[PDB]
Amino acid sequence: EHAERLPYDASKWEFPRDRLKLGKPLGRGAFGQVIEADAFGIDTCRTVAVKMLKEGATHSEHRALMSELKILIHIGHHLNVVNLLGACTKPGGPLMVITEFCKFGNLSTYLRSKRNEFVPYKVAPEDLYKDFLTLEHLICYSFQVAKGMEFLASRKCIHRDLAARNILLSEKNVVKICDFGLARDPDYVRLPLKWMAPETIFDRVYTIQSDVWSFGVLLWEIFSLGASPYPGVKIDEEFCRRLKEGTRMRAPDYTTPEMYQTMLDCWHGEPSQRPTFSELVEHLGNLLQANAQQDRHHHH
Numbered sequence: 001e002h003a004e005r006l007p008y009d010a011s012k013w014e015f016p017r018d019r020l021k022l023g024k025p026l027g028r029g030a031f032g033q034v035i036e037a038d039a040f041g042i043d044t045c046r047t048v049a050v051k052m053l054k055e056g057a058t059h060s061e062h063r064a065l066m067s068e069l070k071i072l073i074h075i076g077h078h079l080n081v082v083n084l085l086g087a088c089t090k091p092g093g094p095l096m097v098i099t100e101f102c103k104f105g106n107l108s109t110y111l112r113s114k115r116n117e118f119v120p121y122k123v124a125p126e127d128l129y130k131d132f133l134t135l136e137h138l139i140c141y142s143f144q145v146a147k148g149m150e151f152l153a154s155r156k157c158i159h160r161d162l163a164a165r166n167i168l169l170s171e172k173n174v175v176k177i178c179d180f181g182l183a184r185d186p187d188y189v190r191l192p193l194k195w196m197a198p199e200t201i202f203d204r205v206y207t208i209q210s211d212v213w214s215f216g217v218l219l220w221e222i223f224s225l226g227a228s229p230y231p232g233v234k235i236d237e238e239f240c241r242r243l244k245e246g247t248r249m250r251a252p253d254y255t256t257p258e259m260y261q262t263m264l265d266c267w268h269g270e271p272s273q274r275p276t277f278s279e280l281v282e283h284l285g286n287l288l289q290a291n292a293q294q295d296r297h298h299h300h
């Protein structure tokens with residue numbers, strides 16, 4: 001622990017506060033707030049999201065945000081993990097942590113907005129389906145999250161709150177894993193129980209294999225175009241009993257048979273019998289390739 005104590009390469013990370021144009025609020029937490037900004041010369045102009053420590057923060061709050069900064073630095077860069085771009089740590093203003101802005105926001109809300117703009121696959125004339133989501137998009141998002149999680153695992157990380165609300169969508173259909181820190185809201189019971197593996201619910205065990213369970217729930221979210229898990233079910237002791245017994249969600253409205261089986265696999269009762277993220281990357285990549293290449297219309 002005590003990640004805040006890690007060496008800080010200021011030449012790499014430090015960004016001048018006066019090179020930010022602060023814009024609309026994006027969200028608030030115990031730390032302070034996250035606001036949209038345009039940053040000049042952070043890499044040109046680039047839109048970013050800036051998490052800033054509130055004035056009058058406690059030592060523990062301040063330590064927590066610095067720890068977060070150091071954790072993001074330690075993990076390192078991956079396409080599918082929200083990209084840390086800079087920080088403002090020196091005297092003269094608040095502690096600020098700067099990440100890339102993702103135009104389309106969280107994946108759950110985005111997918112929900114596209115329910116009248118989805119077709120399994122385009123057919124010519126394709127302009128009838130301009131900016132529509134397809135199965136190819138959904139498998140692509142799934143593959144990317146698996147890639148991100150594979151990367152996090154290789155960094156010896158465990159996410160602990162994997163869910164569609166914690167995935168951000170940028171341009172060029174690139175998705176990014178984040179942690180909005182909502183554990184520290186209707187998705188959280190005073191714990192994100194709907195996303196938690198049975199060993200996590202009953203025994204507070206968190207491993208990369210419980211993240212795999214959560215990934216299964218995330219897949220269900222994707223292939224339902226942003227529905228809330230376990231429709232029509234109160235999340236109480238009977239829910240937990242039935243989960244232990246082997247009851248699982250039914251196939252969502254937009255799934256393929258293969259994708260549903262993958263959900264079921266992720267939801268194995270035994271952590272060791274669930275696929276690894278490496279296996280998921282392989283499997284999903286193969287499913288994506290098949291999907292992306294199967295229509296030979298334009299390939300005479």
Ligand SMILES: CNc1nccc(-c2cccnc2Oc2ccc(Nc3nc4ccc(C(F)(F)F)cc4[nH]3)c3ccccc23)n1
Nearest residue numbers: 026027034049050051081097099100101102105178179180
């Ligand atoms: C609407 N578009 C958009 N684009 C980018 C960011 C946001 C955003 C909006 C409201 C609140 N937070 C937002 O972004 C963040 C998410 C998570 C953050 N923190 C975070 N801390 C993390 C630590 C670890 C990992 C792991 F990679 F392991 F998954 C991911 C983590 N994510 C942010 C930190 C600083 C600034 C923004 C952060 N919103």
